[PDB]
Amino acid sequence: QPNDITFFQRFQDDILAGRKTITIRDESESHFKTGDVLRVGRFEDDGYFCTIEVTATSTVTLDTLTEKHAEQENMTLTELIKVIADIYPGQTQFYVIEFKCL
Ligand SMILES: [Ca+2]
């Protein structure tokens, strides 16, 4: 059973505990959609750790990321923008995937 999506393992505990319920991705992962059931692995070792159900998707830009996006990331907004500047340098167009761990 291959993984459909991966996360940095520093997110694993937040996802399993339900503290992190969205992910913000670039055009590479814009194909996920409400109702998808996805096997999730760690980015570093591809260890499966959960199956998620996508509950909502939306587009977002750097300048329209909100406090509520940050809360759903278990982050402050300033922290979230810094994460995005590191993982998606120079990018401004993103896609929000909201999910629940099954
Ligand atoms: Ca940084």
Side-chain angles (χ1 to χ4, degrees), residues 2-102:
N3 299 316
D4 302 288
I5 189 168
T6 64
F7 291 85
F8 292 143
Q9 27 186 315
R10 68 177 204 233
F11 294 130
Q12 173 168 326
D13 283 353
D14 279 358
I15 292 166
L16 289 173
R19 292 188 293 264
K20 173 169 161 68
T21 54
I22 70 171
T23 184
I24 294 162
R25 303 291 175 121
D26 72 358
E27 170 60 25
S28 323
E29 282 95 323
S30 61
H31 48 105
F32 300 119
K33 66 192 176 302
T34 297
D36 286 348
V37 173
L38 307 176
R39 292 185 67 84
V40 180
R42 292 177 284 271
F43 174 83
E44 291 80 352
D45 68 354
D46 286 62
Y48 165 90
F49 66 92
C50 69
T51 298
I52 64 180
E53 183 182 327
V54 177
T55 55
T57 66
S58 53
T59 64
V60 74
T61 62
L62 193 58
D63 62 6
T64 53
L65 288 166
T66 76
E67 295 287 351
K68 305 208 177 182
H69 292 128
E71 191 284 333
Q72 295 176 119
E73 290 269 11
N74 193 32
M75 294 179 195
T76 67
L77 180 55
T78 297
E79 180 186 11
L80 174 56
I81 302 304
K82 280 152 79 164
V83 168
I84 290 166
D86 282 334
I87 180 178
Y88 302 118
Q91 299 185 52
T92 62
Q93 313 293 307
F94 306 106
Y95 307 80
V96 177
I97 305 156
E98 314 190 13
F99 58 84
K100 60 187 180 168
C101 195
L102 299 178

